[PDB]
Amino acid sequence: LMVCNLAYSGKLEELKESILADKSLATRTDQDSRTALHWACSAGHTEIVEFLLQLGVPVNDKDDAGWSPLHIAASAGRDEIVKALLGKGAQVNAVNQNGCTPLHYAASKNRHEIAVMLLEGGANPDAKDHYEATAMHRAAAKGNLKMIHILLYYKASTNIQDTEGNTPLHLACDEERVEEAKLLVSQGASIYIENKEEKTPLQVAKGGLGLILKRMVEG
């Protein structure tokens, strides 16, 4: 639609005069079940979402797949848009297409402020997706150490079994992250849980890193 270009390019007076001339344009969606809030959150505009959320657009408007705007602001890295969506009362544990939560995608961008805002509002630290994977599996899958640490500021678990039976320690050792493995082990990781491949975290680690893993377990 035209409001997709208006909210995409950031036309201030064109969108203001367009909504003040026709209030239906705010509630109108395109063929992909995406309203102006999804385009203005995907673009990161503050004033446009302040006008749309000021008029009182439903914050829980999901698309065809189920992507809530809180995933767009969480993954977007825009702290102010998370302040606005959480200010309007967004669902901190909204279910998207693949059953994930905004914690996984805010963790993907390594945005600490968004994680504090979401987890402070009542987000589940151990929120599991369809594949039984939490934000620690993905943050550890890229190397977000401080994201896992601020996840541990909210008493998150470090032994979530993945769809293959892999704990966050398995993915930390698979990513060849030494400090992350030593920190997860030092903070309560289990080295005895095995996956579907029947491989312990010691065997998954190469270069004799399992000896210092279990060494730090006993030490």
């Binding site: 395109d30 995406r34 995907s42 992507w67 767009i72 993954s75 995608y105 994977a133 769809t163």
Partner: protein, 238 residues
């Protein structure tokens, strides 16, 4: 007529290539034949592109089925013309791919064409033994099957480099998503952790072509920037 494969091919391949008589002044050893393995990884295209971009010379791209014709004698004509133009023009690189289909033992005479062209493989297999002294060519190699390979190729001195491909190409997934999203419109909603963790389970090839299919599904003009809809939809389609 990783950095292990890039480093090993780097110092073992391009460093001997950029010097003449280096074989003579290094205490000659023949690690000239480099062999790759691993069916699930795509390979054999971006590595050859990187070879074709790092060095500026000639390249002989000949997939193993390039000489499978009705004329049994065309083999030595083509590979011998390539041999002479290689040793004469410039130190090119011969890319022999999928040696499993032309490197399998055979006892019967129904497939006498394949036994004849594998005897040609023995002929050039001895010519490369004669070409051990200051040859102006490189012979890289890649295969996806190692069970039916002939023991003569795997004999030491011929193929002294046997690299492997891992099932999870996590760094190649990150580079193959960054190399396509760096030019395409960047959406801040696009995640790469579930799209680097899911192909860890369901591994496949040509991920860049999957992103191009995601763009061909995102060219609807209703969606200005690509998102997860055509990512997971492009996964479930192809």
């Amino acid at each position: 007529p990783m950095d292990i494969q890039k480093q090993e091919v780097r110092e073992a391949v391009e460093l001997p290539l950029t010097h003449f008589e280096l074989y003579k002044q290094i205490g000659i050893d023949p690690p000239r034949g480099v062999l790759m393995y691993g069916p699930p990884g795509c390979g054999k295209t971006m590595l050859a592109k990187a070879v074709a971009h790092h060095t500026t010379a000639a390249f002989i791209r000949v997939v193993g089925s390039e000489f499978v014709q009705k004329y049994l004698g065309e083999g030595p004509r083509m590979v011998r013309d390539v041999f002479r133009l290689a040793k004469e023009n410039a130190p090119a690189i011969i890319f022999i791919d999928e040696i499993d289909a032309i490197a399998t033992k055979r006892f019967d005479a129904q497939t006498g064409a394949d036994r004849e062209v594998q005897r040609i493989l023995l002929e050039l297999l001895n010519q490369m033994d004669g070409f051990d002294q200051n040859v102006n060519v490189k012979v890289i190699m890649a295969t996806n099957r190692a069970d039916t390979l002939d023991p003569a190729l795997l004999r030491p001195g011929r193929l002294d480099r046997k690299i492997e491909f891992p099932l999870p190409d996590r760094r190649q997934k990150r580079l193959i998503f960054s190399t396509i999203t760096s030019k395409m419109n960047l959406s801040e909603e696009v995640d790469l952790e579930d799209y680097v963790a899911r192909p860890d389970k369901i591994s496949g090839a040509d991920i860049n072509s999957i992103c191009q299919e995601s763009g061909m599904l995102a060219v609807r003009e209703n969606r200005y920037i690509v998102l997860a809809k055509d990512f997971e939809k492009a996964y479930k389609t192809v």
